[PDB]
Scaffold this active site. Structure first.
Site, PDB file in Angstrom:
ATOM      1  N   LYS A   7      41.242  60.744  45.214  1.00  0.00           N
ATOM      2  CA  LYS A   7      40.794  61.910  44.246  1.00  0.00           C
ATOM      3  C   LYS A   7      41.686  62.835  43.677  1.00  0.00           C
ATOM      4  O   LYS A   7      42.387  63.054  42.575  1.00  0.00           O
ATOM      5  CB  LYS A   7      39.054  62.342  44.101  1.00  0.00           C
ATOM      6  CG  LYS A   7      38.325  61.670  44.586  1.00  0.00           C
ATOM      7  CD  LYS A   7      36.474  61.727  44.118  1.00  0.00           C
ATOM      8  CE  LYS A   7      36.424  62.907  44.913  1.00  0.00           C
ATOM      9  NZ  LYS A   7      36.407  62.204  47.278  1.00  0.00           N
TER      10      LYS A   7
ATOM     11  N   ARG B  71      27.715  64.387  44.360  1.00  0.00           N
ATOM     12  CA  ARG B  71      27.504  63.648  44.624  1.00  0.00           C
ATOM     13  C   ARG B  71      26.598  62.813  44.837  1.00  0.00           C
ATOM     14  O   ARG B  71      26.656  62.425  45.933  1.00  0.00           O
ATOM     15  CB  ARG B  71      29.175  63.528  46.031  1.00  0.00           C
ATOM     16  CG  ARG B  71      28.888  65.266  46.533  1.00  0.00           C
ATOM     17  CD  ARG B  71      30.443  65.421  46.653  1.00  0.00           C
ATOM     18  NE  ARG B  71      30.942  64.489  47.966  1.00  0.00           N
ATOM     19  CZ  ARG B  71      32.262  64.814  48.130  1.00  0.00           C
ATOM     20  NH1 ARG B  71      32.922  65.501  47.742  1.00  0.00           N
ATOM     21  NH2 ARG B  71      32.550  64.212  49.406  1.00  0.00           N
TER      22      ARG B  71
ATOM     23  N   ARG C 219      46.419  62.644  57.289  1.00  0.00           N
ATOM     24  CA  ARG C 219      47.402  63.462  56.136  1.00  0.00           C
ATOM     25  C   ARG C 219      47.657  64.929  57.135  1.00  0.00           C
ATOM     26  O   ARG C 219      46.454  65.096  57.824  1.00  0.00           O
ATOM     27  CB  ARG C 219      46.087  63.679  55.361  1.00  0.00           C
ATOM     28  CG  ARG C 219      45.876  64.967  54.188  1.00  0.00           C
ATOM     29  CD  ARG C 219      45.539  64.964  53.627  1.00  0.00           C
ATOM     30  NE  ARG C 219      44.031  65.768  53.668  1.00  0.00           N
ATOM     31  CZ  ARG C 219      43.212  65.868  52.697  1.00  0.00           C
ATOM     32  NH1 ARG C 219      42.415  65.803  51.939  1.00  0.00           N
ATOM     33  NH2 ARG C 219      41.490  65.328  53.095  1.00  0.00           N
TER      34      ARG C 219
ATOM     35  N   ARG D  53      43.972  69.168  58.353  1.00  0.00           N
ATOM     36  CA  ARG D  53      42.880  70.330  57.824  1.00  0.00           C
ATOM     37  C   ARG D  53      41.747  69.392  58.806  1.00  0.00           C
ATOM     38  O   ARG D  53      41.397  68.881  59.722  1.00  0.00           O
ATOM     39  CB  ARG D  53      42.578  69.306  56.609  1.00  0.00           C
ATOM     40  CG  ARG D  53      42.048  70.728  55.590  1.00  0.00           C
ATOM     41  CD  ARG D  53      41.433  69.699  53.697  1.00  0.00           C
ATOM     42  NE  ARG D  53      39.957  69.231  53.453  1.00  0.00           N
ATOM     43  CZ  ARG D  53      40.187  68.067  52.894  1.00  0.00           C
ATOM     44  NH1 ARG D  53      40.778  68.404  51.779  1.00  0.00           N
ATOM     45  NH2 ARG D  53      38.231  67.727  53.144  1.00  0.00           N
TER      46      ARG D  53
ATOM     47  N   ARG E  53      31.616  62.487  57.779  1.00  0.00           N
ATOM     48  CA  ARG E  53      31.688  62.590  56.302  1.00  0.00           C
ATOM     49  C   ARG E  53      31.826  61.234  55.263  1.00  0.00           C
ATOM     50  O   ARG E  53      31.429  61.271  54.216  1.00  0.00           O
ATOM     51  CB  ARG E  53      33.302  63.178  55.613  1.00  0.00           C
ATOM     52  CG  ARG E  53      33.692  64.986  56.231  1.00  0.00           C
ATOM     53  CD  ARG E  53      35.190  65.080  55.868  1.00  0.00           C
ATOM     54  NE  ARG E  53      35.272  64.831  55.243  1.00  0.00           N
ATOM     55  CZ  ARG E  53      37.023  65.517  54.731  1.00  0.00           C
ATOM     56  NH1 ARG E  53      37.852  65.321  55.517  1.00  0.00           N
ATOM     57  NH2 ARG E  53      37.190  64.852  53.136  1.00  0.00           N
TER      58      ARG E  53
HETATM   59  N1  AP5 Z   1      47.006  55.778  46.938  1.00  0.00           N
HETATM   60  C1  AP5 Z   1      47.766  56.118  47.722  1.00  0.00           C
HETATM   61  N2  AP5 Z   1      47.956  55.104  48.924  1.00  0.00           N
HETATM   62  C2  AP5 Z   1      48.176  55.953  50.214  1.00  0.00           C
HETATM   63  N3  AP5 Z   1      47.836  57.147  50.433  1.00  0.00           N
HETATM   64  C3  AP5 Z   1      47.630  57.951  49.768  1.00  0.00           C
HETATM   65  C4  AP5 Z   1      47.185  57.721  48.147  1.00  0.00           C
HETATM   66  N4  AP5 Z   1      46.438  58.139  48.082  1.00  0.00           N
HETATM   67  C5  AP5 Z   1      46.388  59.468  49.029  1.00  0.00           C
HETATM   68  N5  AP5 Z   1      47.110  58.990  49.684  1.00  0.00           N
HETATM   69  C6  AP5 Z   1      46.949  59.833  50.894  1.00  0.00           C
HETATM   70  O1  AP5 Z   1      45.611  59.533  51.406  1.00  0.00           O
HETATM   71  C7  AP5 Z   1      45.135  61.745  51.747  1.00  0.00           C
HETATM   72  C8  AP5 Z   1      43.979  61.548  51.225  1.00  0.00           C
HETATM   73  O2  AP5 Z   1      44.502  61.416  49.782  1.00  0.00           O
HETATM   74  P1  AP5 Z   1      44.238  62.587  49.071  1.00  0.00           P
HETATM   75  O3  AP5 Z   1      44.196  62.840  47.608  1.00  0.00           O
HETATM   76  O4  AP5 Z   1      44.428  64.246  50.066  1.00  0.00           O
HETATM   77  O5  AP5 Z   1      42.687  62.644  48.922  1.00  0.00           O
HETATM   78  P2  AP5 Z   1      40.750  62.912  48.275  1.00  0.00           P
HETATM   79  O6  AP5 Z   1      40.017  62.099  48.496  1.00  0.00           O
HETATM   80  O7  AP5 Z   1      41.281  63.976  47.073  1.00  0.00           O
HETATM   81  O8  AP5 Z   1      40.462  64.064  49.460  1.00  0.00           O
HETATM   82  P3  AP5 Z   1      39.303  64.515  50.651  1.00  0.00           P
HETATM   83  O9  AP5 Z   1      38.981  64.862  51.567  1.00  0.00           O
HETATM   84  O10 AP5 Z   1      38.461  64.966  49.111  1.00  0.00           O
HETATM   85  O11 AP5 Z   1      38.044  63.584  50.435  1.00  0.00           O
HETATM   86  P4  AP5 Z   1      36.494  64.437  50.653  1.00  0.00           P
HETATM   87  O12 AP5 Z   1      35.574  63.608  48.870  1.00  0.00           O
HETATM   88  O13 AP5 Z   1      35.835  64.372  51.293  1.00  0.00           O
HETATM   89  O14 AP5 Z   1      35.958  65.635  50.313  1.00  0.00           O
HETATM   90  P5  AP5 Z   1      35.918  67.099  49.932  1.00  0.00           P
HETATM   91  O15 AP5 Z   1      37.459  67.521  49.868  1.00  0.00           O
HETATM   92  O16 AP5 Z   1      36.098  67.088  48.062  1.00  0.00           O
HETATM   93  O17 AP5 Z   1      35.100  68.480  50.381  1.00  0.00           O
HETATM   94  C9  AP5 Z   1      35.846  69.480  51.731  1.00  0.00           C
HETATM   95  C10 AP5 Z   1      33.842  69.521  51.475  1.00  0.00           C
HETATM   96  O18 AP5 Z   1      33.615  70.946  50.752  1.00  0.00           O
HETATM   97  C11 AP5 Z   1      32.329  70.068  50.164  1.00  0.00           C
HETATM   98  N6  AP5 Z   1      32.019  69.584  49.362  1.00  0.00           N
HETATM   99  C12 AP5 Z   1      32.770  69.223  48.212  1.00  0.00           C
HETATM  100  N7  AP5 Z   1      32.241  68.780  47.164  1.00  0.00           N
HETATM  101  C13 AP5 Z   1      30.720  68.895  47.185  1.00  0.00           C
HETATM  102  C14 AP5 Z   1      29.554  68.722  46.733  1.00  0.00           C
HETATM  103  N8  AP5 Z   1      29.401  68.107  45.214  1.00  0.00           N
HETATM  104  N9  AP5 Z   1      27.859  69.112  47.087  1.00  0.00           N
HETATM  105  C15 AP5 Z   1      27.911  68.884  48.390  1.00  0.00           C
HETATM  106  N10 AP5 Z   1      29.134  69.517  49.073  1.00  0.00           N
HETATM  107  C16 AP5 Z   1      30.075  69.168  48.412  1.00  0.00           C
HETATM  108  C17 AP5 Z   1      30.993  68.812  51.267  1.00  0.00           C
HETATM  109  O19 AP5 Z   1      31.003  69.733  52.899  1.00  0.00           O
HETATM  110  C18 AP5 Z   1      32.706  68.534  52.033  1.00  0.00           C
HETATM  111  O20 AP5 Z   1      33.104  67.542  52.722  1.00  0.00           O
HETATM  112  C19 AP5 Z   1      46.871  62.336  51.669  1.00  0.00           C
HETATM  113  O21 AP5 Z   1      47.087  62.368  53.132  1.00  0.00           O
HETATM  114  C20 AP5 Z   1      47.000  61.130  50.342  1.00  0.00           C
HETATM  115  O22 AP5 Z   1      48.792  61.939  50.801  1.00  0.00           O
END
Ligand code: AP5
Ligand code: ZN
Length: 216
Positions: free
Chosen positions: A13, A88, A127, A160, A171
């Site tokens: 994302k 989400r 990552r 991370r 997660r």
């Molecule tokens: N096409 C491709 N091919 C190969 N490799 C590729 C690729 N594209 C990317 N990559 C590689 O893959 C890896 C991932 O890419 P990257 O683009 O970094 O992935 P991402 O999906 O943005 O990664 P996240 O860690 O965000 O997933 P997320 O949904 O778990 O948790 P969130 O951060 O929102 O949130 C963190 C925490 O916040 C809280 N939180 C966030 N939002 C909310 C909400 N709405 N409500 C409640 N709590 C929330 C929760 O506790 C949550 O766990 C990288 O190494 C990249 O290089």
């Protein structure tokens, strides 16, 4: 262009949001980023969120909705907006549907980036982020020229805090459970579009462009 990106943890994302931002100029609203900023500044909101984030749990709806509501309370969001990681849960989505109806800014598309779970686990656990500039690499999929070090500045790469195997497993479990009914919700609204996230980054973004091209 009023757009939600969704996908299971590691689906790419943030990687796609950066591209969407650079091309269309809509603001990127990332809950994950907003929470990490609060955590790093040690604000009351930060310290509250941290207990949940560190375990791989969702932050309660109450605070989350309220921080998003008002982020969207801004003039930069009249162009449109890119929500990344919100909603989400169905309750988040339903709050957002109400707020946006009242705001005159309903969602055009929810783009759901689909990636097999085995690869998701690999994406997160492999990552590595530069401690100097924040650039993201991946051990296998996008490695640095020299292992453990950033190409741009020689900085040490780190994993991370919530990317270790046990926290990744939690997660995925949490988000798989909430994603099932959320997708049903947006499909009933006819705004869901799925994209294959298991392509190279440029090809994923190519598919995103076909979806959004009509909303330029
Ligand atoms: N096409 C491709 N091919 C190969 N490799 C590729 C690729 N594209 C990317 N990559 C590689 O893959 C890896 C991932 O890419 P990257 O683009 O970094 O992935 P991402 O999906 O943005 O990664 P996240 O860690 O965000 O997933 P997320 O949904 O778990 O948790 P969130 O951060 O929102 O949130 C963190 C925490 O916040 C809280 N939180 C966030 N939002 C909310 C909400 N709405 N409500 C409640 N709590 C929330 C929760 O506790 C949550 O766990 C990288 O190494 C990249 O290089
Ligand atoms: Zn760097």
């Amino acid at each position: 262009m009023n757009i939600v990106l969704m996908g299971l943890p590691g689906a790419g994302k943030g990687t796609q949001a950066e591209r969407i931002v650079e091309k269309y100029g809509i603001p990127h609203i990332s809950t994950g980023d907003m929470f990490r900023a609060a955590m790093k500044e040690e604000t009351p909101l930060g310290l509250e969120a941290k207990s949940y984030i560190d375990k791989g749990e969702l932050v309660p709806d109450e605070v989350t909705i309220g921080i998003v509501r008002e982020r969207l309370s801004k003039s930069d969001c009249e162009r449109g907006f890119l929500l990344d990681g919100f909603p989400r849960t169905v309750a988040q989505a339903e709050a957002l549907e109400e707020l946006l109806e009242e705001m005159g800014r309903p969602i055009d598309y929810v783009i759901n980036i689909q990636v097999d779970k085995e690869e998701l686990i690999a994406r997160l656990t492999g990552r590595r982020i530069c401690s100097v500039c924040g650039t993201t690499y991946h051990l296998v999929f996008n490695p640095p020229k020299t292992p453990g070090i950033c190409d741009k500045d020689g900085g040490e790469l780190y994993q991370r805090a919530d990317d270790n195997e046990e926290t990744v497993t939690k997660r995925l479990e949490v988000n798989m459970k909430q994603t099932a009914p959320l997708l049903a919700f947006y499909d009933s609204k006819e705004v869901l579009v799925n994209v294959n996230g298991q392509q190279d980054i440029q090809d994923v973004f190519a598919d995103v462009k076909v979806i959004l091209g009509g909303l330029k």
